[PDB]
Symmetry: D2
Subunit: 235 residues, 4 copies
């Protein structure tokens, strides 16, 4: 019988040791206590799964790159293991995404009140992200379904953030960042990606007086990331 405070302590310890699989597992155990998460427990869960899926996405990109070159090389003798190793990483990546998506759908989005608007946007942004990670590796009909699922999660998150959060709020800014990345990289819609990132940046600078003493550093950091992407995409 392990206490909730000890599990959060375990996640913090795993983060310092860079053992993100342990970190994700501890925060998954906290979620499964079937109680709402604090703002702190929410970010610990987010950081854990971002680093776990990040390592899988990086590995998949490396092996897929080698796979495209091996097929072009003409050596049929080597293609078998490259494809199988890419598939192995791909299934691991998908299982990480499905693991987070089950947590969001059966616990986090399912049981946060209609009043906890910050929590709702935070979880729907995560949902958009993990369906986007699934979209990156998916093909054909499987791809179209997860793309729609990602779009649906980002749009709902966007509507609640627009209505209940200031344009400078790091959750609203972070959402605009990832949703515009989804338009650019997944939907291949550079105009809509640039518009979304421009609107978010301009709405934040127009309401710069709404910057909070506890999160102004996070706000200015994401505003810069939005401007960075806007520069990259428009050049």
């Amino acid at each position: 019988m392990v206490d909730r405070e000890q599990l959060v302590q375990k996640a913090r310890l795993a983060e310092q040791a860079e053992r993100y699989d342990d970190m994700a597992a501890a925060m998954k155990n906290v979620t499964e206590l079937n109680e709402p998460l604090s703002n702190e427990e929410r970010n610990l869960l987010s950081v854990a799964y971002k680093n776990v899926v990040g390592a899988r996405r990086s590995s998949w990109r490396v092996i897929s790159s080698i796979e495209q070159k091996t097929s072009a090389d003409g050596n049929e003798k080597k293609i078998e293991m490259v494809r199988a190793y890419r598939e192995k990483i791909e299934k691991e990546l998908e299982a990480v995404c499905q693991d987070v998506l089950s947590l969001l759908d059966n616990y986090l989005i399912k049981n946060c009140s209609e009043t906890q608007y910050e929590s709702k946007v935070f979880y729907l942004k995560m949902k958009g992200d993990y369906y986007r990670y699934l979209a990156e590796v998916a093909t054909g009909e499987k791809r179209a379904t997860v793309v729609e699922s990602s779009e649906k999660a980002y749009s709902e998150a966007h509507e609640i953030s627009k209505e209940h959060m200031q344009p400078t709020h790091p959750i609203r800014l972070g959402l605009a960042l990832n949703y515009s990345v989804f338009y650019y990289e997944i939907q291949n819609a550079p105009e809509q990606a640039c518009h979304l990132a421009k609107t978010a940046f301009d709405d934040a600078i127009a309401e710069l007086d709404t910057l909070n003493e506890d999160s102004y550093k996070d706000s200015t950091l994401i505003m810069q990331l939005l401007r960075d992407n806007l520069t990259l995409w428009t050049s």
Copy 2:
């Protein structure tokens, strides 16, 4: 006969080529046209002399360090050239400071109106800085005079900024940064240095609504530098 716009273009060209002596010389020529400087011409002058004096201060520190070791080494045969080379760098550093101080006293502070409060604080901060650079290399009675001169320039700048600028203004924040460094490093007053940097940071976060769309990045950068120094000095 060289135009003012061409001299500012020369300073910008010298900055890109990292030829700061050329940059300082071009901005010194602009000042000597005996007209007020634009906000742009002011920062170009400031950046030029900061890089020129910065290179001299770095060289003086290196040779002074070797000088202290050579005297401790007991080799009297080598002390002569080290001391003379340190003295050579030292005179160059002092002549750079006197060059900037003459520009401020006979042009910049001398001819900006009682209404141009931003200009006044900007020039008195520069004056405090260049007397502080002189204090670093000076000894005895010579040191006490330049320390007083630095203190007098920073205090006047502090009074005008407190009265006519928002606590988040980068000129007011930058002034608090350097004036607290003067207390810590020159006056060896850690308490007064920490108090000055704390007050400035706290006044800025208390009036975070006064952040300007054109300079919020500069404000948040100096606020962080203040917090950095406060952490270093209190640990």
Copy 3:
């Protein structure tokens, strides 16, 4: 039924994806085919387990550091999970070491001929290393046994390398590097560590004519690492 060439391909693919656990597992499967390893398969096995044990050693150091501070902090409420998390990492580290040590004792050292002197030194250096990693985390009577085991493996490796390899050979140089680290860090014998590293470096420069066209870069790299450690330990 997976081919030996495909398993080596899997290890190379895992190395590019930085999935060292996969890499170690593939090379463990190659070893278990119960045939000698090529020079290439040997280094792939060595690199795999070095990165696997390296991550465990780094994690153990981080959590042990936090453990020493938490005990000193006086918060008895937090000591329980830190100790248990350190113990968890520690058991993982020990199981990695025992896994490699079983491979060396039941396959690699057990079945390489009396003639394959390069192979013998290579495997006995690995044995010295993995017992040294065990010594780092062990205490009391358990520590003394693994220290002796490490010493015994390094000494045998040292005798065969002295007799059958040139002083510039990267395996002989690499052995002198790790064996001197064992004296310094494990045995706390700075004199014997410095002597071993000095002798190896001096023997290599005295026979610089024995440098091989295929490994001169590896030789000069380890010679520098020996000189680096010698500088650090003698200052």
Copy 4:
């Protein structure tokens, strides 16, 4: 009246302070004592002028780059100062080269004996280099003359090094490095550049037994630089 040992001490002090103009001036004063240079005084002179000309070459490249863009921009109002500032840097660069070339022709190459083969190759490599720096900024008939002058200096250096130095000697390796760069960048002869760098590298690995205890690190460093350039040029 300043002693030769004090001037070399001044050059070493200037090098630590990164005051390369002072360093070059001190070594120019040593050369002008009209006596041969030691191996140490030779490298101090070489390092001084390399850093002085290096800063001019870097500045010229930056301003020439801006000049090509300003002419393409169509703003005739700005072209005047860019061209004049480039010309100013260019004359400084040329005067540095002529300063070194006068030292080599009226002192160093002029008065080293027919027996000091290391000194002869060292000075003729420098001569090839400084005429190459002149070739980089020169155009038309002026360019053809300095290109021939560079070629003539490198070829003579190449003949003496081939006859009196081992293929692993850092002076012979360094010569092959710069002479092949001259073929690639100045003469636009990629085949001849690759052949020269390949021959030098292959001659060095074929005589790896000729590596000296006092300069093996310099030899292996330049051998790698040759292999680096060979990779870049053949891909």
